[PDB]
Amino acid sequence: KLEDVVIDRNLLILGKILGEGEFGSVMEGNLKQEDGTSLKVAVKTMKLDNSSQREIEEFLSEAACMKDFSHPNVIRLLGVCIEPKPMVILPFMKYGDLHTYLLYSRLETGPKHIPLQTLLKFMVDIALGMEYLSNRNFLHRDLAARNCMLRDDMTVCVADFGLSPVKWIAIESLADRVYTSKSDVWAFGVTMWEIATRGMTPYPGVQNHEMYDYLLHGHRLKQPEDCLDELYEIMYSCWRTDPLDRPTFSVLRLQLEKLLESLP
Ligand SMILES: CNC(=O)C[C@@H](NC(=O)[C@@H](CCc1ccccc1)NC(=O)c1c(C)noc1-c1snnc1C)c1ccc(C(F)(F)F)cc1
Ligand SMILES: [Cl-]
Ligand SMILES: [Cl-]
Structure with a gap:
């Protein structure tokens, strides 16, 4: 479940905050891809309830499920990063x-x-x-x-x-x-x-x-x-x-x- 969606943290460069909330933040970023090119990304950081492993498991399960989704009218999930702070990587x-x-x-x-x-x-x-x-x-x-x-x-x-x-x-x-x-x-x-x-x-x-x-x-x-x-x-x-x-x-x-x- 982890291996299918998790992207290495050194492949992501974080920039300015686009939006900020109570349980998360949206930031502009750069993602170095497999083909050697860098893509502009929107990074959604999320504050998970770390008192149990239920939210992180449910997070990774949803991420693994989303990776397989492919439709032109649904935002493509590029992958996830962990800093225990999860980051959702989407196209900018x-x-x-x-x-x-x-x-x-x-x-x-x-x-x-x-x-x-x-x-x-x-x-x-x-x-x-x-x-x-x-x-x-x-x-x-x-x-x-x-x-x-x-x-x-x-x-x-x-x-x-x-x-x-x-x-x-x-x-x-x-x-x-x-x-x-x-x-x-x-x-x-x-x-x-x-x-x-x-x-x-x-x-x-x-x-x-x-x-x-x-x-x-x-x-x-x-x-x-x-x-x-x-x-x-x-x-x-x-x-x-x-x-x-x-x-x-x-x-x-x-x-x-x-x-x-x-x-x-
Ligand atoms: C609980 N689940 C929701 O409430 C659905 C909600 N999920 C979340 O807000 C969060 C939920 C994280 C979570 C926290 C605690 C326990 C389990 C999971 N997960 C993402 O942010 C996410 C992930 C993990 N992997 O991709 C995306 C996102 S966020 N925007 N687009 C994508 C693909 C969502 C995600 C995606 C879409 C869509 F439009 F299709 F792209 C619509 C709604
Ligand atoms: Cl109005
Ligand atoms: Cl009305």
Whole structure:
């Protein structure tokens, strides 16, 4: 398990901090590869509960499982490093996260106004990434626009740069410890709304502490102004009270492809 993913620490050069949290940090870095070239990397350092070997074993098991994953809409895991501090090595993406990109697109110096066709392709990319993980019974647990990364060819891939998200958490997950693929589907619906609104924080006028009661009374994210009824119908189906009534990522992906293909 260790031998399959662990990269020698002297092959990694650490740079500046990109982001910092309570249980981790994201840093820019250089990784010397097998072919003798150096690749630009994003290094996610994680604080593990070292009071038992349960977290390090579960960490290495997930890393060994991820190494074998290969999909264009899922971030590629290059390997891991141990300084007992584990480090996740991922490719560095100059276009950054999708949430920041959507916000820059609304400003003059940032990318040009994103058309509807491009917004929907961002969604199809995430759905394709999530369909791949859902098929291998892998739970994301932190799906949001901030965790979706833009590759150099402008394709979107799913990642987890979280360093610890009440407004993305499924109603059943707020009531109980319960978290399934249908909870990732709820978070996807919220991720879609973030894209459609070009980076708005979910539920304007609603506090984080009011969220459970707000959802319990049947209220959901409102339809955005420039949003097609067919698109809002897809994101709303992600927020059905009973998780069983929510569509699979496979169904969601095809609905989005069919809707994207019907546009000029
Ligand atoms: C608990 N597990 C989660 O909560 C899922 C979550 N994992 C983590 O946050 C952490 C979890 C580390 C851990 C701590 C204690 C016990 C066990 C494990 N593991 C990575 O950071 C990671 C690893 C180990 N190997 O690769 C990546 C990452 S992080 N971003 N992309 C990759 C591939 C995750 C990872 C990857 C994705 C994806 F989009 F597919 F890339 C989505 C969600
Ligand atoms: Cl905003
Ligand atoms: Cl709303």
